[PDB]
């Protein structure tokens, strides 16, 4: 997993502003990995009760992506600009728009 075994944790000082941006990106990584995991599980579950819960949990992890992204964009103005630039590049090359 991504969490650290407490036996190995010997950090005492709080995150710097830049490390705070990094743990937000890592939190998004964790959520995206969880979404992929549950979507994959749902694909092979012919038990409709298990599939329904897997898909509903995955939906809630997608909201977690939004929460961590809102914090990241607030702390990373460069990401705001480049996110818009990335959207524009996709539009120009493919026509896909929000």
Q: Binding residues for Fe ion, per CB under 5 A?
A: 31, 61, 64
Are the C-beta atoms of 38 and 54 separated by less than 8 Å?
A: yes
Instruction: Say what the alpha-carbon torsion angle 3, 9, 12, 18 is, to the nearest 10 degrees.
Output: -40
Q: How far is the CB of 84 from a copy of itself (least distance, A)?
A: 7
Query: Residue 75 phi/psi, 5° resolution?
Result: -95, -15
Out of Fe ion, a copy of itself, none, what residue 23 binds, judged by CB under 5 to 8 A for its kind, is a copy of itself
Q: How many CA atoms lie within 13 A of 31 on its CB side?
A: 18
Stretch 69-88 residues interacting with a copy of itself (CB under 8 A): 69-76, 78-80, 82-87
User: By CB under 8 A, how many residues form the interface with a copy of itself?
Assistant: 85
Stretch 10-29 residues interacting with a copy of itself (CB under 8 A): 10-11, 13-15, 17-29
């Amino acid at each position: 997993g991504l969490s650290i075994n407490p036996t190995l944790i010997n950090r005492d000082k709080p995150y710097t502003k830049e490390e705070l941006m990094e743990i937000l990106r890592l939190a998004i990584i964790a959520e995206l990995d969880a979404i992929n995991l549950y979507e994959q599980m749902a694909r092979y579950s012919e038990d409709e009760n298990v599939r329904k819960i897997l898909l509903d949990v995955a939906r809630e992890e997608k909201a977690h992506v939004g929460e961590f992204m809102a914090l990241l964009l607030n702390l990373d103005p460069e990401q705001v600009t480049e996110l818009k630039g990335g959207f524009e590049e996709v539009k120009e090359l493919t026509g896909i728009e929000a």
